[PDB]
Amino acid sequence: ERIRDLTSVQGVRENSLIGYGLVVGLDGTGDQTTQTPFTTQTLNNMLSQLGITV
Amino acid sequence: NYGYQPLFEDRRPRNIGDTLTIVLQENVSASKSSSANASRDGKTSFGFDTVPRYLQGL
């Protein structure tokens, strides 16, 4: 198992992925949403996509 | 079917046919001005109202 533990193969590599989301179902431990406008803005975006226009 | 539609990304136009609102707000104001002037005044005088006799030839 030495060669695998010492080297890596050319072209066999891992990339990094990033994204933004919302986490729901918290027990009152979410954002204040008065100091983080993007939380409410993106929630309204999600609702508008789902068919609710606040 | 309309293809992948994001859920938290803002509603932007992405393809041909999508609509976008333009708030026309133009306020352009340019100006320029210039001037130039010149003046020149001169007076000269000499009067021998009473000429002394030794200087009456000059």
Side-chain angles (χ1 to χ4, degrees), chain A residues 3-54:
Chain A
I3 288 193
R4 60 186 299 114
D5 276 308
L6 292 171
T7 62
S8 55
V9 189
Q10 180 188 42
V12 180
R13 56 164 295 186
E14 307 86 14
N15 299 270
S16 194
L17 305 175
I18 192 172
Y20 165 90
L22 291 176
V23 170
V24 292
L26 310 173
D27 280 71
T29 56
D31 294 8
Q32 257 63 21
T33 70
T34 57
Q35 304 181 156
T36 64
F38 46 84
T39 303
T40 44
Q41 179 177 350
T42 54
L43 187 92
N44 290 133
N45 285 334
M46 178 183 59
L47 297 185
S48 179
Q49 181 60 49
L50 290 176
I52 297 94
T53 302
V54 194

Side-chain angles (χ1 to χ4, degrees), chain B residues 1-6 11-20:
Chain B
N1 189 12
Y2 296 147
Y4 175 64
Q5 297 153 308
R11 42 186 206 92
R12 296 180 179 173
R14 312 175 189 272
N15 300 319
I16 291 186
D18 285 14
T19 65
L20 170 65

Side-chain angles (χ1 to χ4, degrees), chain B residues 21-40:
Chain B
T21 312
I22 312 287
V23 179
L24 308 169
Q25 43 183 72
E26 307 292 336
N27 250 92
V28 179
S29 183
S31 299
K32 65 177 180 187
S33 61
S34 66
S35 64
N37 57 269
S39 191
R40 200 175 74 175

